[PDB]
Amino acid sequence: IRTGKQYLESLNDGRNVWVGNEKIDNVATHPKTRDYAQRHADFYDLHHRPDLQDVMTFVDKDGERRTMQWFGHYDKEQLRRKRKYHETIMREMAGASFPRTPDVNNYVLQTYIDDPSPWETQTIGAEGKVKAKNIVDFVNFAKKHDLNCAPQFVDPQMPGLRVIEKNDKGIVVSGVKAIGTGVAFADWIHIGVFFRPGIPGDQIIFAATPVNTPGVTIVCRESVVKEDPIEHPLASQGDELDGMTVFDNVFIPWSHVFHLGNPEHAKLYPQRVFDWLHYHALIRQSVRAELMAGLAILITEHIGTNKIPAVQTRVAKLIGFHQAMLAHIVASEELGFHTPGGAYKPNILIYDFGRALYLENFSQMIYELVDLSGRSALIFASEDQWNDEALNGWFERMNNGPVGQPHDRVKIGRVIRDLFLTDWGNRLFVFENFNGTPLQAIRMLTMQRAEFSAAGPYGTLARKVCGIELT
Amino acid sequence: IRTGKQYLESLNDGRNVWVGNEKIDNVATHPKTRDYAQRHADFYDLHHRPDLQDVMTFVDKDGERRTMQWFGHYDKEQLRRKRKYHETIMREMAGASFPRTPDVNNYVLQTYIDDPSPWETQTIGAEGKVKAKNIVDFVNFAKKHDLNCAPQFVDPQMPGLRVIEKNDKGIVVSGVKAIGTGVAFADWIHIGVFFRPGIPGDQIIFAATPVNTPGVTIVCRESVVKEDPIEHPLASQGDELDGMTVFDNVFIPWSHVFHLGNPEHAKLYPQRVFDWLHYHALIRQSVRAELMAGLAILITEHIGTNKIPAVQTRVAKLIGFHQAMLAHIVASEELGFHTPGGAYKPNILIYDFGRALYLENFSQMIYELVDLSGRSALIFASEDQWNDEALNGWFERMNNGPVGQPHDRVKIGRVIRDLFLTDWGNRLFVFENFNGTPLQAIRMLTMQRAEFSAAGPYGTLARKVCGIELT
Amino acid sequence: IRTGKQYLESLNDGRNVWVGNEKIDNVATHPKTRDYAQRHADFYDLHHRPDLQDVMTFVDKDGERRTMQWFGHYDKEQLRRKRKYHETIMREMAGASFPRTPDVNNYVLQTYIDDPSPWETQTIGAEGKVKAKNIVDFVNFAKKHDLNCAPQFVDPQMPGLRVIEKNDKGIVVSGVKAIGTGVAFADWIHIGVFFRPGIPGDQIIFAATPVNTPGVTIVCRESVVKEDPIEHPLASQGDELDGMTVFDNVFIPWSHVFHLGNPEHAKLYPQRVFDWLHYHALIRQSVRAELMAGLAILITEHIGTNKIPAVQTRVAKLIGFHQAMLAHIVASEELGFHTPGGAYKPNILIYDFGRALYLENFSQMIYELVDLSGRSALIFASEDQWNDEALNGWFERMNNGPVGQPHDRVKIGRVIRDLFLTDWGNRLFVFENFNGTPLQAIRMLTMQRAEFSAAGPYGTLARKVCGIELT
Amino acid sequence: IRTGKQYLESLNDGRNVWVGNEKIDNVATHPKTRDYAQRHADFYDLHHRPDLQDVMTFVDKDGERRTMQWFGHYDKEQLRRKRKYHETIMREMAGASFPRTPDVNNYVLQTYIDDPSPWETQTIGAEGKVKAKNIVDFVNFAKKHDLNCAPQFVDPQMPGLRVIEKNDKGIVVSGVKAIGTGVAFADWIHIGVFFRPGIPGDQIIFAATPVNTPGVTIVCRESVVKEDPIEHPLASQGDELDGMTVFDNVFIPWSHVFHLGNPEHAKLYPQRVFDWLHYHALIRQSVRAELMAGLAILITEHIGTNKIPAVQTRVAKLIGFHQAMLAHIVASEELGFHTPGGAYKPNILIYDFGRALYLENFSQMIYELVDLSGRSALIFASEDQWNDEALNGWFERMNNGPVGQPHDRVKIGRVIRDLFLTDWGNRLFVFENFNGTPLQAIRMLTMQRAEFSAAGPYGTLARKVCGIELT
C-alpha cells in the first residue's frame, strides 16, 4: 500500500547523515543521494503496477493486501513465488545493480517470525524485559507500513557497539556498526551481531531503532553517481551508499530489543537470520551472470566476431557461468527443508556453494566480457561527437555491423563501461564480497558440518572403496 | 534375467580379438581379459541380488520382470529412478571405475524405440528394405536376453566404415571403427556415425552385428590389470579395453540395418542417440567427485592435517566440485522436456554444461587430492613389509594419527594410487575426454542454438538494459 | 634542453580537439586536459634536475647534450642504461600510471634511425620521391627539439586512412586512425600501418604531420580526471586520453613521408618499429607489479593480517608475479642480439612472453590485492570526516594497527581505490591490452617462427627422446 | 674417473634392501633393480665419452682431471658451465626422467667444503670430537672415487633419527629417515635434518655411513619398470625407487660425523645445503618443459591440427611455460651472490620463484599436452599389431598426416604414454612436489625475509605513491 511519495516524504526526518565531506540536509533531494532515493521510490511504486499485482502482492490472513516482501513460503512452489518476486524487482531495476532494495533488507526478518521464542528465552541478564512478542509485533508493524529495516551485524576489525546502561525503560548503547549499505535511505536500523572468539556479552545485541534516532550518525563514502544520463545510462540512476553507523549514548526502549547477552545464541541464530540474504544474493548473482552473457552475445554480434571459434567458446563459458548459478538455485529449492516454524528453506549447503562458485569466478568472467568487447570498452563516441555533422559519417562507417544500427555498439559500450569500468560499477564489484559471508568463510563453515568428518555419512563411498571400518 | 555364468559362456564364440601383441582364445578366461569379464558377470549378478531387487529391476506393462537398463522413463520421478539404478551399479563397481558397463551401452537404444520411423523414412537406397519394425524388434530381442550392445560411432580423424555391396539379402561393409570400449566384452556391435562436412552417403550406416561376425576383428590396447589385489585392490579388478574394430567385407542382413544413405539424418539423430550417454557421464562424474572428496577427507583426517585452514579450504573446494555436478543433474531433471516418443529427457544444455564444468576442472581437482595426500601417495608399505617383525613397529609408529588404525593409511593410499597414479587409473583420466563430446564441442554446440543469437530470447535482459530493439 | 614551459606554450597552436562533448580551446589550460598536460611538462622538467643529469641526459657526437629518450644502445650495459632511464621516469610519475610519456612514443623511431634505407627502396610507386634521408633528418629534428611524436598505426575493424592524391609537392590523405593515446598532447602524429590480409597499397602509409595540421581532428573519450587531489591523490593528476584521429584531405609534403604502397614491407618492418614499445611495456608491467605487491604488504601489515598463513601465500604470489616480469626483462637483455644498424636489442621472444605472462594474469592479481584489502577498498573516511572532532576518535580506534598511524590505512585505501576502482584506474586496466600486441596475438605470431616447426631446432629434444628422424 | 662396470660391482656389498615384498640379493642384477642400476652405470660412462669430455670433465688446481659433479663455481660463467653439465646429463638420460642421478645427490656437498668450520664450531656434546677436517676429508674422498652420496634429511611428519649412545669411538643412532630416493643405488648415505618447532638436540645429526652399514635397511616401494622396451621405451629404462631407511643401532665413527646437538644451526645451514638441489630442480624443470612443448609440436604437426588457431594458442602456452623457467634460471644467475667460502650462487628468491611457477602449473601444462594428443594418447597400435599383414594397411591409413611416417605417431604416443600415463610416469609427477620445499613452503619462506616488511626496502615505491613514511 505504501507509495514512493510517502517514502520520499519520510526521508526528510532530521536524520544525521554524512556522504563524503558533506552533511545531507534531505536525502530525497540532495544531488548526491536523490537518484538512489528515487530508486527506492520506484520500488514502492512497482508494487502498485496493475499488471504486476499477481507478482508483487498477496492477501494476508486478515484479508489485507500486502507486498510480497513480507510473504512466508511454506512449500517449494511458494518459495519459487518469492524468487519470482525478487527477480522481477531486480530485473526492472538496472539489471540487479542495486543489491540492497528493501525486499532484501527485510527478507532476513522472516527468521524472527518463524521462531521468536529462543531470542527471548536465551537472553541473559535482562530480567525478562526482552519479550519475543515484541519482535513479532515490530515485524507486523514493519509489514503493515512496509518499513525498510537496513540490517547491521558487521563489527569493526581487531569500538564495537555495546550496552553502557540498562534500566526499567530500556537500554543505552554506544559504539560503531562498521558496515552498512543504504542505511541513509532506510526507515529502521536493524541491529545485530555475529559470534566471534572472545566476544563480550555487553556487545551481544539485537534490536531496532529509527534511522533518525537521537545519537545516531550515518557516515557514508562519497557518492559516485554520474551527472549525464545519456553517457551513463546506469551509473546516473543512483549510488547505493555504504558506510558505518555511530551510536552516541543512543536509547532503545525494551520493546525494540530482541535479545541480549548470550554469546552462545549469537553463533547459530544470526546465521539463521542471514541465510535469506545469502539465498537472495545467489538469485541476484544469477541475474548479473545472465546480463553479462547477454552483453557478450550483443557485443560480439555487433562487431561480428561471434562465429570466430575462439570467441564462441568464450561466450559459452559466460553462458555456462549463468547456468551454474541457475542450477544451484534450482537444485537448492528442489532439495530444501522446513524450519522450526514450518517455513520452506532451500538447501543451505547447495546455494552457498552456488555463491562460492560466483565469488571464485566473477572477476575472470568480467574480464572475459571486457576483453571480448575490445576497444569498445574505453574508446567510443560521446553523443555530441556521434551526432556532429562532420564526424557522424566516419562514426557510422566504423561501427557498421551485421546487426542493428551502428549506434547500437555505443549503447552496448555505455552499459559495459558503467557496469565494469566506473567507480559506480566497481563499488558493486567490491561489494559482492560483503553481500553475505565471503568465499573463504563459506568454505570454512562447510568444513564444520559434522557430516564431513571421517566417519561422517558423506565419505561413506570412500570408506567402502578403501575397505575401511564399517558399523 | 541373464546371469553372469551365462554371460561368461557366451564369450567363447570364436570372436577374434587382439589385446596388445596377443590374440585371445577366450576373453572369459584369458589372464589379460578375465577380470574385466568377471566385472561384467558381476554386473548381471547384481540384478539377482535379493536386497537390490527394488533398485535393479522393474515389472513392465506385461508383468514381465526386467533389468532396469531396459527401463523407459516418461516422468521426472522415473528418470530419477533410472539415475538411482545407474548410481547403484557404479557404487557397487569400484566406484564408477567402469564407465562402459552394459547399462550404459544399452542406454542409447532408448532413442530408437522412442521414435523409430524416421530412421526408416529417411533412408536412401531404400527399396523399403530398411524397416523400422526390425529396429524395434532388435531392441526388444536385446531386451529379452539382456544383450550387451557396444556403441561405435566415432570415426577416424581426417578410412571409416563403408558399404561395398548391397543386395536384397543385406549389405556388405568394409572399413574400421576407430574408437570402441569393451567391444571385446559385448554381445553385439552397435554401428553408427556422425555427420561431418562432406560425408559420402555410402558411409551413413546404422546397424548391428554380433561381435564374432565373420570379417570382424577387435583390436585392443595392451591390458593393464594388476596381478596383486592386496597391493592393487582396484587396478587388479580388470581393464576396460579400448581399441578399434575392423570390418573386412562384413555381411549384415536387412533385419539388422537401421538406416542408410542420408547424411542430413546423420546431423541431429545420432546426437539424440548419445544424449543418453552424455547424461550418464554426468551421473558418473558426480559419483567420481564424491569419491574424490571422500578420499581427501579420509587422508587429511588420518594424517591429522584436516583442521589446517588452508587444508580445510581445499577439501571444501573438492566437496564443492561434487555439489556442482549434483546441482546440474538435479536442475536438469527439474527442467527436462518430452521427446517425440514421449520419453522424458533432462535439460541437455544444463547437463552438458555440467560435463563441461567437470572436463574443465577434474584434472586440477585430481591434483588437489594427490597433493593433499603428500608422500602417503607415493611411498607406503607393501603388505609383506608391513607385517615384517623388524619393520612393522616402525611402520605403525610412522602411520599413527588422530583417526582409525595406522594401517588404514595404507588402505587409503592404495586406492588413491590405483585411481590416479597407475596406467589403470590414467586410462580413465584420458577416457573422460572421450565419454561424449569433448569440452570444446559442448561449447561450439551451444553457440549454434538459435536462442543465443543477438535477437534471441536469451539476450532480452541485456537488450533492455542497453535500450536496444531487435528484428 | 626543452622545458615544460616551452612545451606548455606549444600546446596552444590551433589544434582541433574534442574531449567528450567538448571542444578544447587550449589543451594546456582547459580543466579536462590541463593536469595530464602538466604531467608532460613535468617530464621535460625532470630532465633538468641536476641530481638526475647522469640518468636523464647524455652527450651526442656533435658535443650537444640531449635527453636519454634519443639514446641508442649498442651493447647490454647501454640497454640497461636506457631501461634505468625509462624506470626512473615512470617511478617519479605516479608509479607507471602514464604509459605513453614521450620517451615511450619516441622510442619506436630508433628502428628508422637504425636502418632507414628499406623504407625508401621498398616504396612502390612514388617515383623516388620518398627519401630515406628525410626520415633520418626528421628524427634528428625531433631529437634536437625533443618533439613528442605520438604513433598511430592501428586502423578500424572490418574508413582506413588512404592516399587520395599524389603530386610533385607531396600527398593528400583522407580517413581515420582508429586508436591513439595522448595525441592531443603530442607535437607530431607518427602515421603507420600494420599488414592485414587483403590490404590495399593506397592504405600503406608511413609519415609524420603536426598535431595541428589543417584537416586533422583529434576525437577523444571524455576525461575522467578527478577534482579533489586529497581524496584522489592519483586520479587527480591527469587522464591520458585515448581517441581517434580524423583526416580530411590532409596534405603531407614528401619530406615527411617515410614509405608508401608496399604491403610486403608492412608486415615485418612495422613490427620492427613496435618491438621497442613492447619492451617498454614489459618494463612498465614490472613496475606496476612491484607497486601492487608493495600495496599488498602495506595493507595487510596495517590491518595486521600479514602473518596469517593464507594471506602470506597470497602476498608471495603477488611478489612472485613481480619477479616473473623482472626475470623476463633480465633474461631478454642477457640473451639479446644486434639489429642491421648494430643496435643491441633484447630477446624479442622472451620479453613478449613476459608480456603474455602479465596480460594473462594481471586481472587476477589485481583481484587478489583488492580482496586482501577488504573493506578498506570501498569504505573509508573522506578527509573532512576523519578530522571531524566527533568522528575522529571512532575513526582512529577503527584503523589502529601494528604499524604507522591509523590514518595511514586511508592513504593506502586512496591509492588502491584510484588505481583499481575508478574510471581513471580502469582505463589503464583496459589499455594494458592495447599497449602492444595483445595476448592471443603474441601467442599466434610465436607459432609462426619457423623454429617451432616439427623439424625445427626447438623440438630437437623431443625427436631424440622419441627416436624420430635425424639428419 | 670411475666407470659403470666398477659401479655395478660396488653394488654387491650385502646391503639389505626391500623392493616391495622382496629382499634384493644384488641390486645390480635383480630384475626389479638392474635397469636403473644400469642407468647409473651409464652415468659414469658418459664421462668417458670422448665427444663429451669438454662438457663432462674439468681439470682442477692440481692438474687432476675430475667429473663435473665435483666442480666448484665462483663465477657466473662457471655456474653456467655447471648448468650445461647437468643439462647434458639430463638430455642424455630419458630427458630429465632421472631426477636423482649422482651429480644431483653430490651437488649439496659443495656447501660443506665451502664453509665447513661452523659445522664443527657449533656442535653440542662436542669434546672437539667433531672436526671440520673430517668433513672436508670425506668429500675429498668422495671426490677421488666418484662416490654417490644420497641425501636424506626429511623426517617423519608429526620416530626420526636419534643418538642412543656416544662414546669416543663414535656414535650410535636408531630411528628412520622417512624419504630417500635411489638410496639403494648410492654408495653412502648422507645424514641430515631440518629444524622444526621443539626438536630435541639428540636428533640434530649430520653424518654419513655406507649403504651396507650393519643396522641399516633400505625399504623401497615396488618397482614399476616395464618389460617391453618397444612398447615402453622410457618406462623400461628403470625405476628410481623411493622409500625409507631404518637405523637399528647403527654405528658411526667420529671421522664421519659432521655436526651434533645444536638445533639453531639446523635452521639456516641445512637450507644452505639444499639451495643447490633446488636450483638443479629448476634446471631440470625447464628441460622437462622443453620436452613437453616439443612433444606438443610433434603430435599436433603429425596429426595436422597444428595450424588451428585454438591449437596454436595452446602450443604457444607450452612454449611460454618453458621460456618462463629458462627466464628465472638465466635471471637468477645474472643476479647471484657470493657465499661465505666464495662460491657463486644464483639468486635464491628468483630461482625459487621459478620452482613455484612450475609446481603451480605443471599439472595443468601436462594435461594440456595430453588433451592435445587426443586418442593418439590412449589407443594406438602395439608393434605386432602394426606389423600384422591384415592390420598394417589399416593402421597406416589411419596414421597418415602432413608430416613424417605414419608410424612416427606411434613413436610419439609411446613416449607421451610412458611420461604421463603410467605408474612410472606418475611417480615423477608426485615426486616433483618432493624435489625440494613444496610450493607452500617457498611462499611461506619468502614472507619471512625482512625486506618484505612494511618498512622494508621492497615496499618503498608503494610507500612513496601513498605518501607514507616508515620507522
Author numbering:
A (entry chain A), B (entry chain B), C (entry chain A), D (entry chain B): 2 to 159, 171 to 483
Task: Give verbatim excerpts from the published study on this entry.
Recombinant TcpA from C. necator JMP134 was crystallized in the space group C2, with cell dimensions of a = 107.07 Å, b = 180.05 Å, c = 110.20 Å, β = 97.87 and there were four TcpA molecules in the asymmetric unit. The individual TcpA molecules consisted of fourteen β-strands and eighteen α-helices and could be divided into three sequential segments based on their constituent secondary structural elements. All the nine β-strands in the second segment, β4-β12, were arranged in such a way to appear almost like a β-barrel. Another noticeable structural feature was that three long α-helices, α10, α11 and α12, and three short helices, α15, α16 and α17, which were all from the C-terminal segment, formed a sizeable helix bundle together with two short α-helices from the first segment, α4 and α5. Applying a two-fold symmetry operation to one of the two dimers in the asymmetric unit generates one tightly associated tetramer in a non-crystallographic D2 symmetric assembly. The tetrameric nature of TcpA in solution was confirmed by the elution profile and molecular weight estimates from a multi-angle laser light scattering (MALLS) experiment. The observed tetramer interface had an extensive network of inter-subunit interaction among the C-terminal α-helices. In the apo-structure of TcpA, a unique entry site and binding pocket for FADH2 were clearly distinguishable. The perimeter of the widely open entry site was made with three flexible loops: (i) between β4 and β5; (ii) between β7 and β8; and (iii) between α16 and α17. A structural alignment of both TcpA and TftD showed that the global structure of the two enzymes were quite similar with an r.m.s.d. of 0.78 between Cα atoms.
